[PDB]
Design a protein around this ligand. Sequence first.
Ligand code: ADP
Ligand code: ADP
Ligand code: BEF
Ligand code: BEF
Ligand code: MG
Ligand code: MG
Lengths: 417, 417
Amino acid sequence: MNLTELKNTPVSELITLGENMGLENLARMRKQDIIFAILKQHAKSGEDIFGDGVLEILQDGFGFLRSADSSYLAGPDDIYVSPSQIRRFNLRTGDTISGKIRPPKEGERYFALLKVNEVNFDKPENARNKILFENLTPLHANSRLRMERGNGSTEDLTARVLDLASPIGRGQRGLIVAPPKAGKTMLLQNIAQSIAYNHPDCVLMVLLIDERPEEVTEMQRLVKGEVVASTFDEPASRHVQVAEMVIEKAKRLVEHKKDVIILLDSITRLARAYNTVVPASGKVLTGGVDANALHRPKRFFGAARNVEEGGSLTIIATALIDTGSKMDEVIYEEFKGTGNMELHLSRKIAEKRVFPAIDYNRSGTRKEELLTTQEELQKMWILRKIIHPMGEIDAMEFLINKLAMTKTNDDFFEMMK
Amino acid sequence: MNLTELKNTPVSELITLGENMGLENLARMRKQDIIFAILKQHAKSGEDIFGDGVLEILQDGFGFLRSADSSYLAGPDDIYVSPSQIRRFNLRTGDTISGKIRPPKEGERYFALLKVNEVNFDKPENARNKILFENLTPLHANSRLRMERGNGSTEDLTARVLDLASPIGRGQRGLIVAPPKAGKTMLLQNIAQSIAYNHPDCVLMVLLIDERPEEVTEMQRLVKGEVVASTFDEPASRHVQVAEMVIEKAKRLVEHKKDVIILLDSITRLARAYNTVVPASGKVLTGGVDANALHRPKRFFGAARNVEEGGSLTIIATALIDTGSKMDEVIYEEFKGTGNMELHLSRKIAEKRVFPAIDYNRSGTRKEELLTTQEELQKMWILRKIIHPMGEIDAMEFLINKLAMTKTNDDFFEMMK
RNA sequence: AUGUUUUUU
Ligand SMILES: Nc1ncnc2c1ncn2[C@@H]1O[C@H](COP(=O)(O)OP(=O)(O)O)[C@@H](O)[C@H]1O
Ligand SMILES: Nc1ncnc2c1ncn2[C@@H]1O[C@H](COP(=O)(O)OP(=O)(O)O)[C@@H](O)[C@H]1O
Ligand code: BEF
Ligand code: BEF
Ligand SMILES: [Mg+2]
Ligand SMILES: [Mg+2]
């Protein structure tokens, strides 16, 4: 008796099971209400019920166990967590809790937690003694997260160009700067697919705030990982809540020496949401940005770091420029002094239908020698010195024509000499 | 005895009928008052009266049935809908209701609804069980909505250029960016005529907010569809109300697997109206735009989506640029990074009296391979690569001179090779 | 109202 197991079951089988259990007509009923009635009827027989979810401690002291399939939205099937157990096990926002639950009695509206069985997918004896995320020693990117497929596919050209322009390692904090209508969607899809193919052990999390739902359901059915999104039909409060829950879960996972990867596509939208939810202080800067509005996105971005004791946190955010709004322009570069990695995309190259439209000149990675060998770094330096004199479109055409001849970049580097 | 039937009748016949029924002199009376008196006299004999309209639920709990011929304006002949029936049939704003009505008794001012016969042009048993619009899975444009006439007319050149620049499919969410005095009116008229000619099965709705009455009555007598407009003589409150009613009706139609097409021509004017009706919060951004003013137009724009279960919602809005106001430059923009189709028009080409004055270079459609075949996409790519080096005016002249030689674009593509 | 917008290189 698990909550996620009943959530994954279809509607027809749940209706059939409820009709066999002998309850009210479930055809004219919601799936969540059907599951609730089935759990009630199964607990009336004396059997136990189990559930799971991410903890969201409220300001009063209690909390609930949000579900991932609903993008951490307030649902009727949330498991109530008393503050006594929180104080007894030192629980915090983001801790994954899995234990026995019971249906609400007369006068209650949510399931109660009796005994916790597993904390953060581990024993509670290992979670009671742990080092906080704020005390971990940061470090630079040491492990190399190669994005090249290696299967010789035609779509691998984007990953090869990305590796030649800006290699990505564990704990990297980069930025994907690109004007609208440049190809950010396809680039993010390719990055997510390459991460899921090359490094399936890492925890991939794609955050899409204030996006077109069709794109949400497309990304959810395309990438092999977790997708937490919030369409534009929701207020900025839900955006802030989702961002906080995601970053808290990422911190709790990193605290257990896990490799978390966050592919953010709405850093600008997140900053707009934070500027909308912040109370007015009577002081407005140039472009309509509050003085204390960028602090929360600043911390959300800076949360990414590489841990020496174990694990890492990678955050790749895509910033929006040339959107016609001065607020986004002020945000983007305020954040430019940030992202230890900038991958610029050119609109002029995208208009020529030359995919990918990557600005190789302005791209780059700091401390790239820690992720590449000596000969590889020398070859990349020679390639950059050869590409720099040529124009952007000409350099992109040259790179595409030279990478189409071979499958691996090593052969291209060997033929360049 | 139908309301719309009496509304379509002329004034002279209604006056004659009222004089034959033996009532007060109807020559010095309004047509609506004449219809009201005729309905009263006909109901005094014991016969039944029927009406219809779009439901507009008020904040208190009751509602009225607005009429389409009055642009959903508050009229004396609105049918009152009690909240009891709303609670009994789960009615919402936008549901088309058609049932028996009765004249108001002593102390009443509006017609009452006794029994509902048809809901959303369908049986109530099919409307009681339905999936909300917020739960439908979005998708990209799959079905091709070809705009080419095919009759070899001289006006078909605009549709041919539009198809070669940006093909339109079901569920598309585009933008027509053009400075003033460019030819937006003729272009919108041609688009509406091509939609009514090629795809007469789709529900066409043209929304004109804050425009001149002459243009309104011109569009109403030119296109073959529904025209809901609101001239500048009305406050922004009526603009917001009309936009809400139109989008709610569109959502209710899409919920019944219908293909709705909305040709918006005032996205900038709608954003200005929303910025005017929003209460001041003491925080003004660059250009005079409120922080929470663009949220409602953002949702109105993002409502457009393609449904996998059935139906679609297409919204083609025309944004205004270079109007001398910085608010529109932020308002029209901020919207640039939202849609997935931009059809730019050049003022320099319009000054040369070269119609249509379309910027073929900056135009385009994302995921265009889902609406065109392989050979068609290759021919469009070759045409774009040939047109790109030439200047805007030169490319437009070349395209016009090459399309004037033949009737179909297939012959042009075959002759280009 | 100052900042924002005006405003840019
Ligand atoms: N690698 C690519 N190959 C082919 N087309 C692409 C590629 N990247 C982008 N595009 C085209 O650009 C359009 C928009 O790209 P997108 O990633 O949505 O840009 P952004 O996210 O910056 O708005 C897509 O619909 C696609 O047709
Ligand atoms: N396809 C066309 N053919 C001929 N003249 C046109 C065409 N499109 C626009 N025009 C001219 O431009 C004028 C204004 O066009 P309009 O569509 O009103 O531009 P906008 O809507 O951008 O203000 C029209 O009065 C018309 O004379
Ligand atoms: F319009 Be893109 F997604 F920035
Ligand atoms: F003056 Be146009 F209608 F934009
Ligand atoms: Mg995008
Ligand atoms: Mg116009």
